[PDB]
Amino acid sequence: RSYPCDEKKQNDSVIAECSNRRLQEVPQTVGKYVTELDLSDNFITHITNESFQGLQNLTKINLNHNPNVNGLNITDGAFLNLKNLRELLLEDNQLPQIPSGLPESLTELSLIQNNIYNITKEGISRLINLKNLYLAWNCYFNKVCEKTNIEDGVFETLTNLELLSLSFNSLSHVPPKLPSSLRKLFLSNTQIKYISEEDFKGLINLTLLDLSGNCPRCFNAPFPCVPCDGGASINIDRFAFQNLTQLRYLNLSSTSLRKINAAWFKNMPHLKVLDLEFNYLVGEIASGAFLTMLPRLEILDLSFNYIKGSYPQHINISRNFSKLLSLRALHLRGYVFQELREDDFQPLMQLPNLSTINLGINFIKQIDFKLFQNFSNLEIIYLSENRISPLVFDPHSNFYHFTRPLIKPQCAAYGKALDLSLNSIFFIGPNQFENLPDIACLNLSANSNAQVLSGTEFSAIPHVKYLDLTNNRLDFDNASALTELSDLEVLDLSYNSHYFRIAGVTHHLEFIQNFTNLKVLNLSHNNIYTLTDKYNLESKSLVELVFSGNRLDILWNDDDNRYISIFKGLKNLTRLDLSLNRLKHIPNEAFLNLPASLTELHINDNMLKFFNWTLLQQFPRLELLDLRGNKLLFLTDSLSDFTSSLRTLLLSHNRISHLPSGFLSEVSSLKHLDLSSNLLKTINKSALETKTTTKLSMLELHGNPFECTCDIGDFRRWMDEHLNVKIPRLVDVICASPGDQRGKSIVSLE
Amino acid sequence: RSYPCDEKKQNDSVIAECSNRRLQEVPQTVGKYVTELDLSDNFITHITNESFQGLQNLTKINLNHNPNVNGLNITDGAFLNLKNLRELLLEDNQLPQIPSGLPESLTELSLIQNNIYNITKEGISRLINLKNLYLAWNCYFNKVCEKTNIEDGVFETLTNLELLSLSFNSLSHVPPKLPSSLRKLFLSNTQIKYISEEDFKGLINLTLLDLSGNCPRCFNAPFPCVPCDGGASINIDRFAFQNLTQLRYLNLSSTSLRKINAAWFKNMPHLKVLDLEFNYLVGEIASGAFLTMLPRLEILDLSFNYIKGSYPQHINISRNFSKLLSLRALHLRGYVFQELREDDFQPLMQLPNLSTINLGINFIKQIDFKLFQNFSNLEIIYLSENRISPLVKDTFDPHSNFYHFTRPLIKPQCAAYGKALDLSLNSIFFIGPNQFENLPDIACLNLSANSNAQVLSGTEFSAIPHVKYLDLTNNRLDFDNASALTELSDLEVLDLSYNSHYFRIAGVTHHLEFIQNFTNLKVLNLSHNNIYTLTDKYNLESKSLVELVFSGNRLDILWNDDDNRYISIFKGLKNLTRLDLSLNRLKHIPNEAFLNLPASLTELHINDNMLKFFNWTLLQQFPRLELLDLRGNKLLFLTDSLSDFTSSLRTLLLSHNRISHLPSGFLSEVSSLKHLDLSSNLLKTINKTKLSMLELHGNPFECTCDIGDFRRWMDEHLNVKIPRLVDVICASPGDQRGKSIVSLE
């Protein structure tokens, strides 16, 4: 049983997760098998040539973010003993210099987010097996750091080097004598205002170059930002990229470009991805000679090139966009304009592989929506944060191109996706969706939409499968609401409320029944407290109901018992979420009227005083029961009498102070038991049993006020007699008493 | 010391506040001199005589909401003995009928929210001194009560009756034989679909009639709603209001009206307030004969008469609006239309007293703003929830109002400075160069929640340079330039709550130099701006500022700076008297950082942080401090010599901390302290004052004989008010656990 690290197999080697454990030094208790050691985010202050003796087989060490809340102190040759060390991460350690005497075996070294101002031969030129070297974020807006000093030729000996990152340092010019093995060169935010013909000569293998944030566009910049003199653009010689024939990725975001030299791409016939966000290229977008030079470009980003003070009627798209034959995704966020006409996008209608058009955040008032029918492979039409109306820190993330999917994958997987969230569609006009292609995934979130749904509003796109109506003011009282969407599978009505935001609103949920393949319904935070004519939800198809943030406390304390069968008619339900419903006590017969099909039941974050364990008998398929964050005091002593199906039982954040004699005997079915953050002082001999034996494999106990006398010795031995039962976060399974033990782990005892 | 009630004399009266105290019966422990008794929101199940015995001096009893989680049981003549009882409130008691044998002395009776289906002579006909009778919400969507049965003439004997409310009951018609003393008749949501000539005949003293919600407009209704068949309008005879010559208030909201008979107002020359919200009067608003009949109307409400599925280009306002010579406020919310032209409001431009135009929630895309210059007395232009853009080109509770939103349209504090324009929740995503041209002189401007990302540079507001109160909350503003907003040289109040970057990314930096440039700036609210560094300038400065709200930022980071750059951050606010540093995740304030707060402070809030220690000695540097608020932290100890450190402190708030010991020195005495709040701490006991309030509820008191000391000190100081005694609870020993410390020996 490992301590303090969680050790485990990964692929065909063994790993030690040892992060975020308040460790003040490198433990000497790591398993002998461990080849990768993550000690990030701890309180470690020193590394000597002894910290790692006893582990000569280490391949990888992560020491990032040490220490927390002076700096990390590393003796010379601390690591040169470790002859197999390939990867060493030393990020955010406040290193004042490259540690000296690093092992020759290193293939990857990260020294991101330190105070290293000098890059010397002493430090790295020996590391001839480096493939990837990360030196970003060392000299940026720090009064200490005037400029980064790169010893002439320090990289020239690194003849296997493929990735060099020096982004977020002040370099003023591209350092000379870079090895010809370089594939990716990151020089973002380095104050390189001029790129000569000489800078990238010799880098005939280069596939990526990042020069973003040199002569930034600082208008409305979140972080400090220093334009070039007179907001001039980065200055790139005409022949700067002539020998970069392999370049696939070019990032020129935020270089204040007003014009792009088509000659830059003369010898760059493979360019795949071009980022030109945060420039001034409204003009170039209109004319755009450079566009004729990019027949293999797959991703173009031209976002946030808007002109301050301007809200032009029209977008002006060069006809040259038609030469981007390989284009898969065009990002045009934050151009900012009023109207989009059919003819404005004519050039793009013939791009055979154009699947994503991103027009988020342009505040467009009007779109001729029929224009989207003229594209053969459009799969993502992203129109969030426009003004359509009713129709009657982290260094390893991308700083300028927001990278998460535009549309949730679960929605887009159904087919063609249109996102009109955060527009002004305050009701669904009778022509809202005419001339749209066949939409499978529609997002109308957060439009202040107060439509009275009656069964006709969506008939021009009747094959929507995933409909996101969250954060609106919708009236779905009519039993015909949304029934024109006979193929609907997923409906999200999270955070819906009345167009008055007033306590008292009633609901009618009869529309649910009409759908024969509706699978997932999310009614979260609808503050549902009463239903009108009908008091039962019904569906033969539904598998998942999310009912969090409503008032089942009121529904089930009804005088007339009108809601005791409220979910029973969901005949195929397997997952049910009744969290955040302010439940104190569920009537016994209300609980028995939940569908017997359930496999997963969540009643977390209510205020349950008691639970009737005996009723689990009516749920022969239940695998997961979640009762976290309640006020429960006792556990039944005979659980195996009530279920042979339950695998996962979550009880953390309750008020349990006692485990029954033979709680976990037999229990039988359980694999995962979570009793963290309860009020246990100890565990019994009798609460532990066997002959048994339990099929248990995880037991969570952290955050209980354990009494570390000799009474707990029973538990400690049972721990060693069941190495197979994992107990995570041992460091947080903490004696609260007696005083001399208070605060230590129960595992450190005699 | 009164218990369980808080008894206070005020004016002639002496109150007993006795509500929300988990009382299972009427205490017999109430001072003989008490005249108002509020017992509302308790667990009381029965009222007898004896239940009020030897309490002739009761004027008023409130028994509402008894009991809580069939109910309140009242014996006949339970109140018969109380010969001065004027006012009796019995709301939400689940009464199945009017209690019998109520005292003749009653002038006000409320029986709202019960199950009274029968109004009988036996119940009320003897109460000949009733002025105000409330019977609303008794037969409302109860299957058991099909209809409210009103005994013929039951009210006719009530010849002093001024107010009758029967709203939210199924009457189907106005009951006959109503007394002529009636001034206010409330008949909302009563299913009265027809009003005859006879119903209101001879109500010559009537000043208010409410008929709202009869034949409701149920489209998009929050509550269950049953139109008339099929959605026909309330039916009001031509002569229904002919003898109502004193009518001032007429509420016809939600009666599905398509047309208004001008004859209705023939004999109603003093009508002041007319509510026509939630009808279908788009047509009538265009033609509007009835408008010629209302020369003294002051408030007209035509809100939410939109036609489903329409978004018409234009609003059509009849010329006859020009006949509303007395109009002070016009409410036209939710008509829903795209464009407002100068000529559309021509009829209103000559109304001499029109001070409020309310066009909230019309989703108007464009307004010819110059039209607002043609009004004499416009003080409130309310344009929230429209769709105005950047301009670039030159040119439940029954006693609340169910259909007319009652709070001020614009915060009084802002409107008091003068002419007020509210453009919150529009689409003004940046301030266009013509945004404010052709506006009148605005003193109060609201631009909240427009997704506005303007880079403020000193020129955006120069067409309205006399703004004194500017609300910019909930936007994405850049105020990095030292010149931001300086064109508003008279600015007194600036609200930047919830501003953040138009990317919503942890990392945004701030420059607050603009603040110094203002000569008259008084109140600055920077709450929830997540401020964690300032660039170049590390000090806020101002000779004028009185109030800085700095909640929901990162003073924990600012004050744990390696080079101590922010040790003087607020030093330079020389006039500061109120400062809010709540919700700044503070664990510890450096001693010299605390001493660098302005010595002018009278009110300092550091609540809801996580303070482990507070250096009491430093209060010496704050000779004006009256109020120190440290609620919701983790503090362990109080100094024992507080009077050494201040003679100014009047209010000290320490609830929700971890204090387990109260020094014998505390009450130094600190003659200054008037209000001490030690609720929700960890006190087990207190042991061996100009103080007037001491809060102790929610401490785990040990009720052994060790608390006897405190108990006596309580009786030796009646002047020291202790609220919520019933919640000052023994947690131990077991046999005491859960009892009030007052019930002990």
Ligand SMILES: *[C@@H]1O[C@H](CO)[C@@H](O[C@@H]2O[C@H](CO)[C@@H](O[C@@H]3O[C@H](CO[C@H]4O[C@H](CO)[C@@H](O)[C@H](O)[C@@H]4O)[C@@H](O)[C@H](O[C@H]4O[C@H](CO)[C@@H](O)[C@H](O)[C@@H]4O)[C@@H]3O)[C@H](O)[C@H]2NC(C)=O)[C@H](O)[C@H]1NC(C)=O
């Ligand atoms: C209204 O309610 C619906 C229904 O609950 C919500 O939508 C669901 O949101 C949940 C959780 O947010 C989504 O569940 C997540 O699915 C992710 C995608 O799964 C990938 O890999 C799995 C492997 O089985 C495949 O099934 C799938 O095809 C994908 O390739 C998972 O990554 C998530 O992982 C979970 O578990 C792991 C470890 O256990 C953790 O790392 C994660 O933190 C996480 O717990 C997760 O299962 C679910 O897919 C959604 N369903 C649908 C239909 O959209 C809405 O979000 C809710 N609306 C609002 C406003 O709240």
Ligand SMILES: *[C@@H]1O[C@H](CO)[C@@H](O[C@@H]2O[C@H](CO)[C@@H](O[C@@H]3O[C@H](CO)[C@@H](O)[C@H](O[C@H]4O[C@H](CO)[C@@H](O)[C@H](O)[C@@H]4O)[C@@H]3O)[C@H](O)[C@H]2NC(C)=O)[C@H](O)[C@H]1NC(C)=O
């Ligand atoms: C300028 O544009 C270029 C592209 O032209 C862009 O380069 C990309 O940088 C990002 C961010 O550093 C790289 O993304 C990483 O890729 C590696 C390797 O597969 C992964 O290790 C990373 O994943 C880790 O971190 C993620 C978030 O931090 C986690 O999601 C994950 O769990 C991992 O721990 C990450 O995806 C990307 O590889 C390059 N692109 C190429 C082709 O090399 C560059 O960032 C832009 N510059 C700026 C300043 O914005």
Ligand SMILES: *[C@@H]1O[C@H](CO)[C@@H](O[C@@H]2O[C@H](CO)[C@@H](O[C@@H]3O[C@H](CO[C@H]4O[C@H](CO)[C@@H](O)[C@H](O)[C@@H]4O)[C@@H](O)[C@H](O)[C@@H]3O)[C@H](O)[C@H]2NC(C)=O)[C@H](O)[C@H]1NC(C)=O
């Ligand atoms: C139909 O329109 C009617 C107006 O024509 C609405 O009438 C109003 O009904 C409300 C709520 O039931 C009453 O409000 C209560 O009134 C008194 C206030 O008395 C005095 O004290 C305050 C203190 O400042 C002062 O401001 C006032 O001017 C009063 O002098 C209190 O008991 C309550 O707090 C509450 O305000 C209105 O009084 C009543 N108006 C009139 C003139 O009587 C009617 O509610 C509408 N119908 C529906 C269903 O919405």
Ligand SMILES: *[C@@H]1O[C@H](CO)[C@@H](O[C@@H]2O[C@H](CO)[C@@H](O[C@@H]3O[C@H](CO[C@H]4O[C@H](CO)[C@@H](O)[C@H](O)[C@@H]4O)[C@@H](O)[C@H](O)[C@@H]3O)[C@H](O)[C@H]2NC(C)=O)[C@H](O)[C@H]1NC(C)=O
């Ligand atoms: C940003 O900070 C601002 C300043 O702190 C916030 O505005 C202040 O909000 C408080 C309430 O939180 C208001 O104080 C209340 O004022 C009312 C009205 O008082 C009236 O009667 C009193 C009697 O003394 C009289 O003195 C006044 O002049 C008024 O006529 C009181 O009834 C309350 O009990 C309380 O004192 C401030 O008035 C208000 N200040 C200003 C300048 O508007 C603002 O809300 C914050 N913004 C956000 C989004 O949180």
Ligand SMILES: *[C@@H]1O[C@H](CO)[C@@H](O[C@@H]2O[C@H](CO)[C@@H](O)[C@H](O)[C@H]2NC(C)=O)[C@H](O)[C@H]1NC(C)=O
């Ligand atoms: C519909 O659009 C809304 C608004 O953009 C999306 O809501 C965002 O969703 C992501 C993922 O849950 C969150 O991280 C953001 O915080 C959300 N923003 C807001 C303002 O809510 C939503 O995900 C989109 N729906 C689908 C199915 O893609």
Ligand SMILES: *[C@@H]1O[C@H](CO)[C@@H](O[C@@H]2O[C@H](CO)[C@@H](O)[C@H](O)[C@H]2NC(C)=O)[C@H](O)[C@H]1NC(C)=O
């Ligand atoms: C400006 O407009 C905003 C939005 O209407 C007002 O915000 C309301 O503020 C009150 C009191 O602070 C709250 O009870 C409401 O929740 C707010 N509504 C919203 C949507 O935020 C704000 O008060 C207005 N400012 C002024 C000066 O009147």
Ligand SMILES: Cc1cc(-c2ccnc3cc(O)ccc23)ccc1O
């Ligand atoms: C993308 C974007 C642009 C703008 C904007 C457009 C035009 N002129 C602007 C001027 C500014 O000073 C600030 C922002 C803008 C505003 C909000 C936005 O989200």
Ligand SMILES: Cc1cc(-c2ccnc3cc(O)ccc23)ccc1O
């Ligand atoms: C005041 C208002 C009106 C409307 C609306 C206008 C026109 N036709 C509508 C049709 C609907 O089914 C629902 C709402 C409307 C929507 C939101 C609103 O806030």
Ligand SMILES: *[C@@H]1O[C@H](CO)[C@@H](O)[C@H](O)[C@H]1NC(C)=O
């Ligand atoms: C479009 O995509 C397909 C499939 O990836 C690819 O085979 C084809 O070359 C692409 N067409 C063009 C013109 O790039």
Ligand SMILES: *[C@@H]1O[C@H](CO)[C@@H](O)[C@H](O)[C@H]1NC(C)=O
């Ligand atoms: C119930 O849902 C499951 C999805 O888990 C599916 O296998 C099964 O066929 C469903 N049954 C019905 C009747 O929809």
Ligand SMILES: *[C@@H]1O[C@H](CO)[C@@H](O)[C@H](O)[C@H]1NC(C)=O
């Ligand atoms: C649980 O519920 C049933 C009623 O459904 C009751 O008979 C049984 O004894 C209860 N047990 C407990 C511990 O509540």
Ligand SMILES: *[C@@H]1O[C@H](CO)[C@@H](O)[C@H](O)[C@H]1NC(C)=O
């Ligand atoms: C400081 O505030 C006080 C009290 O509000 C006021 O009298 C005075 O004029 C203010 N001083 C300045 C410079 O604005």
